[PDB]
């Protein structure tokens, strides 16, 4: 009797709005351009499945179309915020050691999880054995770098699809976005680009968690009276 | 009993279908969010193929009209001894200052290329700019 | 009247620079490992330059320096490879320190 009203006012209400968390206010094509998000790798490194997202090549250096990045980033941030609102487990994954410390701190600060270390075979596909039969796996995996340190796709991209976990991923011009649920074409190398991504996801996740508490608290106060 | 056939469809289609068949008793937490706000492309595995024969990538080289002025300026006067500051988003190099003057004089009706290039150098010298010809 | 991406790209200093070979740029030291200076100069990738023998102690984190660029990204395709190998760093020559 009271559960249907709960799930309808709290879980189903945010899904009726195009931008319930106002994540479009977090970034702009200019803010992305200043963070050098449009800078891609050289044309010789281009992945075929990234051509639709490439604005062009400026002297053999691929330029990412920030107009598309802006639309893809909106979807990824919106999805990420909704999953944080629903109290999902969000796992950040990246093997880029230059940013391991930064990413681990961002995860702790937002109340989420990070895996920046060597990824051992079966963390996702064999989790019950490694952690226990009652282990809860992540509801969303966010890749700030989708390639491992031998320039191949991170194994967790394939294994996330195997475990039917949606993935958000920053995909540079040398990356493969086919299996990434919400890809975001953008520079994954420049410290300014990576720092920006961490701020946006950290802010989206933190805002959604605060929004969840406001709604719940209001729904309870009104319930008593 | 989620299917692990990651190369058959997408996580949404595989989840949506097993929910209909009753294999999955409950929908995963993300399913309703994906349905309401789906990605632009459904994440379906594709095998990347090398191009063969006459197939070419559709990426175009980015060029601008002013690049012709920049190519000539670097040939005639070389790179400026002034250092580029790519951190300043409004930085202007000697070449860009040359290009802007070159564009101004072109809009004043001058159409010759070799003449429009020599008058531009004089204007900058009058303004105090150092233009050391390479040769 | 919102500026488009095509406009930002046209008027960016990196676009206006043209080719990077033999271009003088200002860098900033952000990381140091022994005598290896990691210098950001506004591009996608940093460059790694050895500490100069003269006035080596003047080169510290945050010190702004002058570089002569050679390549924005070191990449090459080797025999049998399907894609280019990239070391994920730019090639540049450290000339000295920038002073006011």
């Amino acid at each position: 009797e009271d559960s249907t009203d709960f799930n309808d006012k709290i879980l189903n209400e945010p899904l009726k709005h195009s931008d319930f968390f106002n994540v479009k206010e977090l970034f702009s094509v200019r803010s992305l351009f200043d963070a050098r998000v449009h800078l891609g790798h050289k044309a010789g490194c281009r992945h075929r499945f990234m051509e639709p997202y490439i604005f062009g090549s400026r002297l053999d250096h691929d330029i990412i179309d920030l107009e598309q990045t802006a639309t893809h980033l909106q979807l990824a941030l919106n999805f990420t915020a909704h999953m944080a609102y629903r109290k999902g487990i969000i796992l950040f994954i990246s093997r880029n050691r230059q940013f391991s410390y930064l990413i681990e701190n961002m995860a702790r600060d937002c109340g989420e999880y990070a895996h920046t270390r060597y990824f051992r075979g079966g963390m996702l596909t064999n989790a019950r054995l490694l952690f226990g039969p009652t282990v809860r796996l992540p509801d969303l995996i966010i890749f700030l770098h989708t390639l491992n340190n031998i320039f191949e796709p991170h194994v967790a991209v394939r294994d996330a699809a195997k475990m039917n976990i949606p993935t958000v991923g920053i995909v540079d011009t040398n990356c493969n976005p086919c299996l990434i649920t919400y890809p975001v074409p953008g520079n994954d190398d420049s410290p300014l680009a990576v720092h920006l991504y961490c701020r946006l996801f950290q802010t989206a996740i933190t805002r959604a968690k605060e929004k969840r508490q406001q709604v719940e608290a209001l729904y309870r106060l009104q319930g008593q009276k | 009993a989620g299917s692990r056939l990651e190369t058959v469809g997408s996580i949404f289609s595989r989840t949506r279908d097993l929910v209909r068949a009753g294999v999955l008793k409950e929908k995963p937490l993300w399913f309703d969010v994906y349905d309401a706000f789906p990605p632009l492309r459904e994440p379906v595995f594709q095998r990347p193929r090398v191009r063969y024969g006459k197939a070419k990538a559709p990426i175009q080289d980015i060029w601008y009209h002013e690049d012709r002025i920049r190519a000539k300026f670097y040939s005639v006067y070389g790179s400026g001894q002034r250092a580029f500051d790519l951190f300043n988003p409004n930085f202007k190099s000697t070449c860009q200052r040359f290009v802007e003057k070159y564009t101004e004089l072109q809009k004043l009706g001058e159409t010759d290329e070799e003449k429009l290039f020599v008058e531009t150098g004089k204007a900058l010298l009058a303004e105090g700019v150092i233009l050391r010809r390479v040769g | 009247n919102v500026e488009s991406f095509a406009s930002m790209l046209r008027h960016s200093p990196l676009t206006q620079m043209g080719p990077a070979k033999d271009k003088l740029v200002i860098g900033r030291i952000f990381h140091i490992v022994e005598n290896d200076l990691y210098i950001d100069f506004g591009g996608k990738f940093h460059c790694v330059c050895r500490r100069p023998e003269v006035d080596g102690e003047k080169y510290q984190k945050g010190t702004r320096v002058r570089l002569r660029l050679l390549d924005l990204e070191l990449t090459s395709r080797f025999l049998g490879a399907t894609t280019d190998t990239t070391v994920l760093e730019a090639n540049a020559v450290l000339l000295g320190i920038q002073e006011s």
Partner: peptide, 26 residues
Amino acid sequence: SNEDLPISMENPYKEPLKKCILCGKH
């Protein structure tokens, strides 16, 4: 449409092809 869009043309910065020390000599 838009003036700031890239335009199609040939590489203006392309370097002239290198020549052997005997290029053009009998």
